[PDB]
Every structure is written in C-alpha cells, then in structure tokens.
Design an enzyme around this catalytic site. Structure first.
Site: not given
Length: 181
Positions: A33, A55, A135, A137, A152
C-alpha cells in the site's frame, strides 16, 4: 538504513520492512500500500508492488551500502536478522516502525482477512495484539533473528492498544526470488 526506519516519497512516510538480496542485488521490502504510491523513494526505485489482496512491495536501493541486514530497536541498538520464518499462534514477537518505534506482543491469529474499506481487502494476514500507528506500515515483525512479517494495518493505537495485521514475509520473498540479508 535498517528494518523499522522511515522511508519516504514526497510527503508520504512508511517504514522499511527488511533489506533483502535478489540475485545479489540489494533491495528493501515494505508494504504494498506504500509502494503503490510512487516509484520514487528516498532509498531507491520501486521494482514491484502488490496491494490489495497481498500487502508487499520491493524497492531496489540506489546505495547498496545502505542495505543493513538488521532491525533498528529505537534504543541505539539493532537486532541482527539471519532468516525468515512463519509465525505461530502464541509466538512472542516484536514490531519496529518509524512512528511508534519498538513494541512487543504476541501472535493471536493467522490467515486473517482484513477489510480496509475504500482501500480494499487483504487476505492471509498474521494477527497480533501489538499496537501500531500511521507511518508504521511496512515495518518489521520479527522474533529474535527470524523475520516474520511486514506491518499492514490494524485498529486502535499505541495509547489504547489495538490489533495489527502483517503480511507474511515468506510470501513476499518467494514473489521476488529474494532472501533476507
């Protein structure tokens, strides 16, 4: 730059998952993402992306010397990474990310389906009781020197706590023919 540290593109910020090698060429795994946003990152150029459904995404480093095979612990120390593995329910894990730093908890479920609304649905996610915030992720989920996943999403935050979901690292590694450094 190690696992859990900030990677940016324009005004967006994610966290580096793990530094890896593809046929000896240094790359970095992060969340899909995140890589869907742009091909241009602080550390290099995007060479693959997969989100939603999965992801994960991968970036080739502009500076191979920066491919540090460790996870930053946010206390001036680092955790060496040597292999990748599969998580199990009840496993003690740690997560490193650029917003909230280092947090610990345990794996509470596997193969979880997660609906991110307008962003779509992801399948096959590791579930934990570790908190995370925007942030974080793409950051590292690991147990000692074994890499497990890439942050994720989830619910809540690091004040109230929450549930977080991670893309299993082994599926991202096999997608790209990569090995952890």
């Amino acid at each position: 730059i190690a696992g859990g540290e900030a990677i940016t593109t324009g005004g967006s910020r994610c966290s580096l998952g793990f530094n890896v090698s593809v046929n000896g060429v240094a790359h970095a795994l992060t969340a899909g993402h995140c890589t869907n946003i742009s091909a241009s990152w602080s550390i290099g150029t995007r060479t693959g992306t997969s989100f939603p459904n999965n992801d994960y995404g991968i970036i080739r480093h502009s500076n191979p010397a920066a491919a540090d095979g460790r996870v930053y612990l946010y206390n001036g120390s680092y955790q060496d990474i040597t292999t990748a593995g599969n998580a199990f329910v009840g496993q003690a894990v740690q997560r490193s990310g650029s917003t909230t730093g280092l947090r610990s908890g345990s794996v509470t479920g596997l193969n979880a389906t997660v609906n991110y609304g307008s962003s779509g649905i992801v399948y096959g996610m590791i579930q934990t009781n570790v908190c995370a915030q925007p942030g974080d992720s793409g950051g590292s989920l690991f147990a000692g020197s074994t890499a497990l996943g890439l942050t994720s999403g989830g619910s809540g935050n690091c004040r109230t706590g929450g549930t977080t979901f991670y893309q299993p690292v082994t599926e991202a590694l096999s997608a790209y023919g990569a090995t952890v450094l």
